[PDB]
Amino acid sequence: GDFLVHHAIALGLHTTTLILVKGALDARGSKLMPDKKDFGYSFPCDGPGRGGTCDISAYDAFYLAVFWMLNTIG
Amino acid sequence: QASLYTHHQYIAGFIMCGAFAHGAIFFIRDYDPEQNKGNVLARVLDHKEAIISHLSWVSLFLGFHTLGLYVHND
Amino acid sequence: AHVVKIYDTCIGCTQCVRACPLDVLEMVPWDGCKAAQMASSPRTEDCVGCKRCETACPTDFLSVRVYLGNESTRSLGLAY
Amino acid sequence: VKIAVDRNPVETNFEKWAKPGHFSRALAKGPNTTTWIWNLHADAHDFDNHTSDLEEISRKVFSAHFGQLGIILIWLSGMYFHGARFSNYEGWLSDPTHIKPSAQVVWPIVGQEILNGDVGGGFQGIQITSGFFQLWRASGITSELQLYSTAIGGLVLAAACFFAGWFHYHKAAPKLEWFQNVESMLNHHLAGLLGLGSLAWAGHQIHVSLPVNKLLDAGVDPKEIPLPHEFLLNQSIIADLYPSFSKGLAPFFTLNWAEYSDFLTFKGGLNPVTGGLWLSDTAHHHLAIAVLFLVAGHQYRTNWGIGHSIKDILESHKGPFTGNGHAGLYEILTTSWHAQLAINLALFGSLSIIVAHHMYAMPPYPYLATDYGTQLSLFTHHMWIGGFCVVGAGAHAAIFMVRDYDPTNNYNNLLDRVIRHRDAIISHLNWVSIFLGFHSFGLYIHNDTMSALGRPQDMFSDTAIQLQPVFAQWIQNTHFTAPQLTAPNALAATSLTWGGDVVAVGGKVAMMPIALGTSDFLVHHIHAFTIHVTVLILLKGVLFARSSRLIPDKANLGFRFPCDGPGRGGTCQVSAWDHVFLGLFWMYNSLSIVIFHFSWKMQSDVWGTVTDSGVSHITGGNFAQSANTINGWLRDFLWAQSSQVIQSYGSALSAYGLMFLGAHFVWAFSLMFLFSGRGYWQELIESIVWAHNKLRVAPSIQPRALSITQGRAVGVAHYLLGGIATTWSFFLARIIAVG
Amino acid sequence: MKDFTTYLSTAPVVGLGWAIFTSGLLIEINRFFPDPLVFSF
Amino acid sequence: MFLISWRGYWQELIETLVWAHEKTPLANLVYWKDKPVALSIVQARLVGLAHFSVGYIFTYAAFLIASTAGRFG
Amino acid sequence: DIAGLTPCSESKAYNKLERKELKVLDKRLKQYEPGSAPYLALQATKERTENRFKTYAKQGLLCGNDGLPHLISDPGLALRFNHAGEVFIPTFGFLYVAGYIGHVGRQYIILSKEDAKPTDKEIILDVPLALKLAFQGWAWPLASIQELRNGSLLEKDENITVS
Amino acid sequence: KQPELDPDTPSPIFGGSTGGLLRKAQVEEFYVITWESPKEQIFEMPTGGAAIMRKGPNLLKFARKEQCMALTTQLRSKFRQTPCFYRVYADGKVQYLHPKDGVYPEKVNAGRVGVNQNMRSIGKNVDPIKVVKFTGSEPFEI
Numbered sequence A: 001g002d003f004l005v006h007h008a009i010a011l012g013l014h015t016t017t018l019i020l021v022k023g024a025l026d027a028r029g030s031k032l033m034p035d036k037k038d039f040g041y042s043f044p045c046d047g048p049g050r051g052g053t054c055d056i057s058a059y060d061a062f063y064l065a066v067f068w069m070l071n072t073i074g
Numbered sequence B: 001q002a003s004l005y006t007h008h009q010y011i012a013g014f015i016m017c018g019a020f021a022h023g024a025i026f027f028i029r030d031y032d033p034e035q036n037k038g039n040v041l042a043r044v045l046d047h048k049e050a051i052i053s054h055l056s057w058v059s060l061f062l063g064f065h066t067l068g069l070y071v072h073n074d
Numbered sequence C: 001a002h003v004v005k006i007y008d009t010c011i012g013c014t015q016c017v018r019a020c021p022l023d024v025l026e027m028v029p030w031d032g033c034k035a036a037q038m039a040s041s042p043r044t045e046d047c048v049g050c051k052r053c054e055t056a057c058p059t060d061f062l063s064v065r066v067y068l069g070n071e072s073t074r075s076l077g078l079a080y
Numbered sequence D: 001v002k003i004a005v006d007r008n009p010v011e012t013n014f015e016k017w018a019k020p021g022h023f024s025r026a027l028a029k030g031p032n033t034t035t036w037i038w039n040l041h042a043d044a045h046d047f048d049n050h051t052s053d054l055e056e057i058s059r060k061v062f063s064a065h066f067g068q069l070g071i072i073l074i075w076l077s078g079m080y081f082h083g084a085r086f087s088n089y090e091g092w093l094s095d096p097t098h099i100k101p102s103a104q105v106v107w108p109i110v111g112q113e114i115l116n117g118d119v120g121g122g123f124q125g126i127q128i129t130s131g132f133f134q135l136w137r138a139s140g141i142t143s144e145l146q147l148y149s150t151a152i153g154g155l156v157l158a159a160a161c162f163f164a165g166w167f168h169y170h171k172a173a174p175k176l177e178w179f180q181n182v183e184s185m186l187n188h189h190l191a192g193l194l195g196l197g198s199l200a201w202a203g204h205q206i207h208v209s210l211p212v213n214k215l216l217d218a219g220v221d222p223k224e225i226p227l228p229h230e231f232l233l234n235q236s237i238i239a240d241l242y243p244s245f246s247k248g249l250a251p252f253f254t255l256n257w258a259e260y261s262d263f264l265t266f267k268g269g270l271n272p273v274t275g276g277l278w279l280s281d282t283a284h285h286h287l288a289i290a291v292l293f294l295v296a297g298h299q300y301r302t303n304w305g306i307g308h309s310i311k312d313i314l315e316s317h318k319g320p321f322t323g324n325g326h327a328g329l330y331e332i333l334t335t336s337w338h339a340q341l342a343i344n345l346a347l348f349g350s351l352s353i354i355v356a357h358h359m360y361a362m363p364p365y366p367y368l369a370t371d372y373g374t375q376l377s378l379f380t381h382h383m384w385i386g387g388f389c390v391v392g393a394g395a396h397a398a399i400f401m402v403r404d405y406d407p408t409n410n411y412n413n414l415l416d417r418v419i420r421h422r423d424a425i426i427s428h429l430n431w432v433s434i435f436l437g438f439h440s441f442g443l444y445i446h447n448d449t450m451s452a453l454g455r456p457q458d459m460f461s462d463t464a465i466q467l468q469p470v471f472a473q474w475i476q477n478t479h480f481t482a483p484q485l486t487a488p489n490a491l492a493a494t495s496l497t498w499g500g501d502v503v504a505v506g507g508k509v510a511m512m513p514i515a516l517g518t519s520d521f522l523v524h525h526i527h528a529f530t531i532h533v534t535v536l537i538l539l540k541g542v543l544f545a546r547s548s549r550l551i552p553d554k555a556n557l558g559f560r561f562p563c564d565g566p567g568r569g570g571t572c573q574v575s576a577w578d579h580v581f582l583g584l585f586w587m588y589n590s591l592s593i594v595i596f597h598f599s600w601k602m603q604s605d606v607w608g609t610v611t612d613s614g615v616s617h618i619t620g621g622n623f624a625q626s627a628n629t630i631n632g633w634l635r636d637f638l639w640a641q642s643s644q645v646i647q648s649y650g651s652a653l654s655a656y657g658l659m660f661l662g663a664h665f666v667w668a669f670s671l672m673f674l675f676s677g678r679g680y681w682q683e684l685i686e687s688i689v690w691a692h693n694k695l696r697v698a699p700s701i702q703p704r705a706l707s708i709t710q711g712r713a714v715g716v717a718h719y720l721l722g723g724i725a726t727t728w729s730f731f732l733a734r735i736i737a738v739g
Numbered sequence E: 001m002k003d004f005t006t007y008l009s010t011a012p013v014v015g016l017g018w019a020i021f022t023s024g025l026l027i028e029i030n031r032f033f034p035d036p037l038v039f040s041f
Numbered sequence F: 001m002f003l004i005s006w007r008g009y010w011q012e013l014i015e016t017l018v019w020a021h022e023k024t025p026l027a028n029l030v031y032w033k034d035k036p037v038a039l040s041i042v043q044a045r046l047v048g049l050a051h052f053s054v055g056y057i058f059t060y061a062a063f064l065i066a067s068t069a070g071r072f073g
Numbered sequence G: 001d002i003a004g005l006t007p008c009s010e011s012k013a014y015n016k017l018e019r020k021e022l023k024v025l026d027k028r029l030k031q032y033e034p035g036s037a038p039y040l041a042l043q044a045t046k047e048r049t050e051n052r053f054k055t056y057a058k059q060g061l062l063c064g065n066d067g068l069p070h071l072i073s074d075p076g077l078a079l080r081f082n083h084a085g086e087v088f089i090p091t092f093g094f095l096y097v098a099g100y101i102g103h104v105g106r107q108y109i110i111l112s113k114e115d116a117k118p119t120d121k122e123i124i125l126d127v128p129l130a131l132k133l134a135f136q137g138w139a140w141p142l143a144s145i146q147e148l149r150n151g152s153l154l155e156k157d158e159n160i161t162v163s
Numbered sequence H: 001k002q003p004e005l006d007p008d009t010p011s012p013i014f015g016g017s018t019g020g021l022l023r024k025a026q027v028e029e030f031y032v033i034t035w036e037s038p039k040e041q042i043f044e045m046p047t048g049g050a051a052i053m054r055k056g057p058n059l060l061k062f063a064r065k066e067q068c069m070a071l072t073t074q075l076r077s078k079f080r081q082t083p084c085f086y087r088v089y090a091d092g093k094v095q096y097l098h099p100k101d102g103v104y105p106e107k108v109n110a111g112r113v114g115v116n117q118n119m120r121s122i123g124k125n126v127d128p129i130k131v132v133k134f135t136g137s138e139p140f141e142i
C-alpha cells in the first residue's frame, strides 16, 4: 500500500514541476505569444483573439502550480 | 509531531513554488542573451519543448497507472 | 494610458479601423501595392484596451500590440 | 386553416452525410482544425444558424420532434420488455408487501453477478427504483404474456413515428402557414390531444377498476383473476362486482346522473390496509380533465364565424400605465420557435417540480407508500428535470432576443417598458438577495457560534427561542377544517401530511403528518434565497443581452461568446450564455438543498415502522435540533446517512459506491476546466506537438485546445454530472437499506 | 451504397467497430479464461 | 466563488449598484472616495487562490488537531 | 522468503478469507431451491471462486501478513525464483502491443501526408488501408530498429519552434 | 469645415430608460453626436429602446464614447448617413473628434503625419537589458 501512495506523490510532484517548469521556460516568448517579454510577468491575458488566450501569463501557470502544490502536499 | 511535519511540508511547498516563480521572473525581467550566447542556460531554453513534453509524459504515465490501479482495486 | 504601436509589418487592409469600437487609430500615407495605407495611433486618451483591433489585424505577426498601462475613467469604461 | 405541404423537397440520399457540417457553409469547407469537430457537434441542432429560412427551420423542428418521440417510444418499449422477459413481476404481483421490484439481471463475467440482489420471487437481479411494477399493477396485468405484446405495440408505434418524421421532412414538408396556425395548434393540442386522451384514459380506468380495487386486494392470485376481457364483455360479472352496471346505460342518455356511484366515486384518502389509492377517484379526475380540456379547446374563432381569435384579444388589453400593449406578441410567437420554446420551458419545469411535490405527498399508485425509495427517486428526478427546464427557458429567452427579434414589427410597449427599467430590477433583487443571505444564512452562523460558545439556552431552537412559521400552518389549518366546513361533499383533507391519522402498512407507516418548525422555516428561507439568486442570474443574463451600460454593441457579438476583451479592467462572462452557465450552478445548489431537505424531513419526521406502542421512525427525530445549524447537516444527516454508500461493497449495492467515487472524480475533473484557461494548455499542446514532429507522427488536422466557450461548457457539464451522480448514488444507496 | 460505405468512415465506424471488437475480445477472454492475475510461468 | 465567476459579470452588477446608490432618496450625501469596480482578473484569481490555500490549510489543520488531541488514540 | 513474505499456501489468513467468502456465499445460497436459475448462478460463482483460490497457488506467488497476493515487479527477484510472470513478461506483451499500435498508426498517418487534403482522411479514414496496415505490424521490432538505423524517422530539424 | 456643437437642438421622441446620465456626465464630461437622418424613420437606441426620428439633421448625446461610435457604425450599415462627434470638459470647452479628417478614419484623407509607430519588423525588440528606466511602457523611439 505504500507503493501506490508513493507513486501518487510522484505524480503530484511531477505535475507541479511540469506546471512550474512550463511557466518558467515559456516566459520570454512562446509560440502563441512570441513577444511575451514585453508585457512583464503578471498580466491577465492577451485578449480574446487568436481563438482564445486565457491564463497565458506565467503568473497563471504559477496559479495552477500552487493548486497542484496544495494537492501534492495534501 | 504531525502538526509540525505538515507545517514544514506546506512551508517547503510554498517556498519551492516561490523559487520557481522567481526563476520565471528571471527570464521575464533580468536576462541578457548577448552575454549568454553559448552557456548551459541558453541550451536549456532551446530544448524547452523536449523538457515540457517529457514532464507531460511522466505525469501522464503516473496518473494513468495510479488511477488505474486504484479504480481496479475499488 | 495604453501604449499602442504599429510596426512595419502591415498591408493596409483598413480592417483594424472599421473594427475599433472607439475610433482611436488613423490611416495616413503609406506606399503600398494596391491600397497603400498604414495605421497610426495619434491619440490614446480614449483607448480602453479592449484588444478588438488585434483580433482583426491579419498580419503575421500582428502589426499592432496594445501595451497595457494604467487605468482611468476612459480606460475603465465608467459611465459613473 | 388548411394543410400545405410540398412533395419531395429534399431527395433522400446518403451524400450529405459524407460531408459533415454541410448545414454550416463555414464548416463544410473542411476540418483544418480540431475545433471543427466540436463546432459540428455544437451546431448540428442550431437550425437558425444553418440558414435564415424559417420555413426550413420549422420543418427541421417538426421533424426532430418525431425524432425525439421515436426514442421515447423505444424507451418505453424497452422498459416494458425488460419487465416482460426477465423480472420478478409475477412474484412481486403475488406478494407485493415484501418482495422488491427487480427488472435488470447482469451477466456473469468478472463477478458483476453479485449485483443480482436476492429479491425473491424465485428470481434474482438488480432492484429498480423507477416505479414500473406499481404502475403496471394498476392495469390488471396477471402474467408476463401481456408485456411482450405491449412492448411490440410500442415498438411498432415508434417505427411509425420515425416514419412520420421522415415523411413530413422529405415527402410532406409543410409550410410556415401550417406551422403558424396557433388557432389550430391550440384547439387540437388543448382539445384533441389532451381532452380525447383524458377521456380515453378515464374510460380505461373505469373498466379496469375491477381487479385492483376488489380482486387484487382480496388475496386472489393473478392467475385466479379472470382476464380483463372476461370482465369487460360479460354483463353478469360487472353486475356482480358493481351493482351500478347492467342498468341499461339510461342515466347517461337523459343526463340523469344519479345511479352511477359504484365506479365514479369521490372518497379521498386511503385504507391503512390497502396501501394505495383507488381507481375511481382517478377515473373521475380524468373525466373532469377530459371535459375541461375539451371545452377549453373550443374558445377560438377558426372558420365559421364562431368565437374570437388571439390577435383581437391581444389588441383589446391596454391600460393607463403601459398603453398600447400586446401589440405584436402574436407575431412574437408565430415568428420564432425560440420564443415559443422558452415560453414553454418557463413553466414546464415549474409544473414538473409541482408534479414532484404532488407525488411525494400523494402517491397515485398501489403498494408504493411503503416503498420509501421510489418516492425519493421520482421526486428528485422530476425536480432536477424542472430545474434544467427552467434554466433552459432562461437561456432560450435570450436566444430569442438575440437572433429572432427586432422592435419594429414585433414592437410592444410592454417589452420596451420592461427594458427601460432593466437596471432597477437587478439592483433591487441584488439588495433582496443580500437581505436573504444575511437573514437566512447568517442565522446558521449565529446558531453554530452560540452552540460553540457554551450557551445552548441562547441558540435558536424549538425549545430555547422558537422561530417557526404560522402562515404555512394556517394554510394546513384551512385545509384540515376544509372537510364539512368549507368542503361539505369532501370526506378527507387534501393530504395526510397535516391531518394525523398515522397510516401504516406492515409496520412501515405509509404516511404520517409532517410537522413545520423553526428548521423548516429556515430551510424554506434558504430555498427562497437560492431560487431568487438563480432567477437574478438568469434574468440579468436575458436582459443585458441586446444592450448594456458598458458595451452598447452587444447584439452583434451573438449569443454564445466568452467575453469582449481585457479592456476596461477586464470583461469575462458577459454573454447570456455565461449567465446560463452560472444559473446552472445556482440551480444545482437550490435543487440540491431542496432535495436534501426533502430526504431528511421524510426520514426523520415521516417514515418509520409502527410498533404496538406508536411508531419508531428511522432516525430518532434528529431534524428538530440539527437543521438550525450548518453542522447539524453534517452531524446527523450527511455523516450519519453515508454509511451504506461506503459500506456497500459487500453486497449488490457496490455499484452505488462505485458511481459515488466516480462522480466525485468527475466533479473535481470539472473543477480542472473551471479554474484554468487556454494559454497554458495551448502552449503545453505546442510542446507536445514539438515532441510529435520529431518522429513525424503529428496529425494533419491542427490540434487546438477547446474553445473558451467549450471549456466552460465541459466544466459545467462535468460539474453537474459529478454533483448529480454523487447525490444520486447517496440517495439511492441510503434509501434501499432503510426500506 | 457508395455514399453509405463512405459514411462508414467516421465516429460511427472504427471507434464503434473498433472498441466493439476490443470489448468483445476482452470479455470473451475473461469469460472462457475466468480469473487471470499472473502468467502461466 | 472568486475562481468560477470571473470579472466581466461583476462589472455590470457594480454599475447597477452604483445606479441604485446614486438615486436612493436623501441617501446621496458624502460620496465614496474611490470609484467601485470589479476586482482585476489577476487580482480575482490571486484572491481566489489565496482563499483556496488558506481554507485548505485551516480545514486540514483543524482536522489534524481536533481528531488527534481529543481522543488520544 | 523474499521481503518477509511467505508462499501463499501457508497463509492462515488466506485460507480464513477463502472460508469467509464461502460462508458469505452459502448463507444466501441456501435461499433458493436446487432447480431454479439463481441457485445455478450461485453454484457457478462458487465454482470459479474455488477455482480462483486453487489456481493462484501454483509456481509460487507471495502473500504477506494480510494473506493477499503481492506482485513482485523487480527483474532479478522474479529471476533466481519462479516469479517471471508476476510482472516481467506482461511488460513485454504490452510493449509489443503498444509498439504494434504506434507503428501502424504512424505508418498510416505518414502515408496519408502525400495526397491532397489529408485532413479528410483523419475524419473519413481509409478503412482498407487501415486494415492492411493492421495485418502488417506484427514484425514491428524488426522494422523499427532498422528504420532507425535507416534514418527515415528523424526529422532534420525543420519544425516550428519559438525559444 | 468641421462643424461645432450647437445647443438648443431638438431631440427624437422617446420615453426614457436607465442607462448613463449619471454624476459623471455633470462634473466630468459628456459626448455629443449629430447626423442627418432624412425620411423620418425608426431606430434603436444603444442604451434604451426603439424611437422615431424626424427628417433633417438631429442631435443626440450619451455618456461613453463607444455609445456613439456604435450609432455611427449602424448608420454606415443600413443607409448612408454621416454623423459627427463632440467632446465636453468641465470648463465647458468643446473639442471635435470624429471625424477630424471628415472622411471616416478608416479612409485616408489627403495628407497628415501620424505618431506612435516605428519601422521595425514584428518582434526583434530590445531585451530587458538597458531598459531599466522602463518609462512605463516604452515607445522604443522618442
Ligand code: CLA
Residues within 6 Å of the ligand: A011, A015, A018, A019, A064, A065, A067, B055, B056, B057, B058, B059, B060, B061, B062, B063, B064, B067, D665, D666, D667, D668, D669, D670, D671, D672, D673, D674, D675, D676, D684
Ligand atoms: C480530479 C480532478 C482532476 C483530474 C482528474 C485531473 C487530471 C489531470 N490533470 Mg489537472 N487540475 C485540476 C484537477 C484535475 N486534474 C484542477 C482543479 C486544477 C486547477 C484548476 C488542475 C490543473 C492542472 C494543470 C496545470 C495540469 C493538469 C494536468 C492533468 C493531467 C495530467 C495527466 C497525468 O498525469 O496522467 C493522467 C491523468 C488522468 C486524470 C487520466 C485519467 C482519465 C481517465 C483515463 C478517464 C478515462 C475515461 C474512459 C476511458 C472513457 C470516458 C470518456 C467518455 C466515455 C465519457 C491529468 C489528465 C497537467 C497535464 O495536462 O498533463 C500534461 C497539467 O499541467 N491539471
Ligand SMILES: CC1=C(/C=C/C(C)=C\C=C\C(C)=C\C=C\C=C(C)\C=C\C=C(C)\C=C\C2=C(C)CCCC2(C)C)C(C)(C)CCC1
Residues within 6 Å of the ligand: A024, B019, B020, B021, B022, B023, B024, B026
Ligand atoms: C551522500 C549520500 C547520498 C548521495 C546523494 C547525492 C550525491 C545526490 C543528490 C541530489 C540532488 C542534487 C538533489 C536535488 C535537488 C534539487 C533541487 C530541489 C533543484 C532546484 C532548482 C530550481 C528550483 C530552479 C529554479 C530556477 C528556475 C525555476 C529557472 C531560472 C533558474 C532558477 C535556478 C532560478 C544518498 C542520499 C543518495 C545516500 C546517502 C549518502
Ligand SMILES: CC1=C(C/C=C(\C)CCC[C@H](C)CCC[C@H](C)CCCC(C)C)C(=O)c2ccccc2C1=O
Residues within 6 Å of the ligand: D672, D673, D674, D676, D677, D678, D681, D705, D706, D707, D708, D710, D711, D712, E015, E019
Ligand atoms: C485540459 C483542458 C483543455 C484541453 C481539453 C482537451 C484537450 C479535450 C480533448 C480530450 C478529448 C476527449 C480527446 C479525445 C479524442 C481522441 C483523440 C479520439 C477519440 C477516441 C475514440 C476511441 C472515440 C481545455 O481546452 C480547457 C479550456 C478551458 C479551460 C480549461 C481547459 C482544460 O483544462
Ligand SMILES: CC1=C(C/C=C(\C)CCC[C@H](C)CCC[C@H](C)CCCC(C)C)C(=O)c2ccccc2C1=O
Residues within 6 Å of the ligand: F001, F002, F003, F005, F006, F007, F008, F010, F037, F038, F039, F040, F041, F044
Ligand atoms: C463578488 C465578486 C466581485 C465583487 C466583490 C466585491 C465588490 C467585494 C470586494 C470589496 C468589498 C468591500 C470587500 C469587503 C472587505 C473584504 C471582505 C475584506 C477586505 C480586507 C482588506 C482591507 C485586506 C468581483 O469583483 C469579482 C471579480 C472577479 C471574479 C469574481 C468576482 C466576484 O465573485
Ligand code: SF4
Residues within 6 Å of the ligand: C006, C009, C010, C011, C012, C013, C014, C015, C016, C017, C037, C038, C039, C056, C057, C058, C059, C063, C064
Ligand atoms: S489591421 Fe493590421 S494589417 Fe490591417 S491596416 Fe491595421 S495594422 Fe495594418
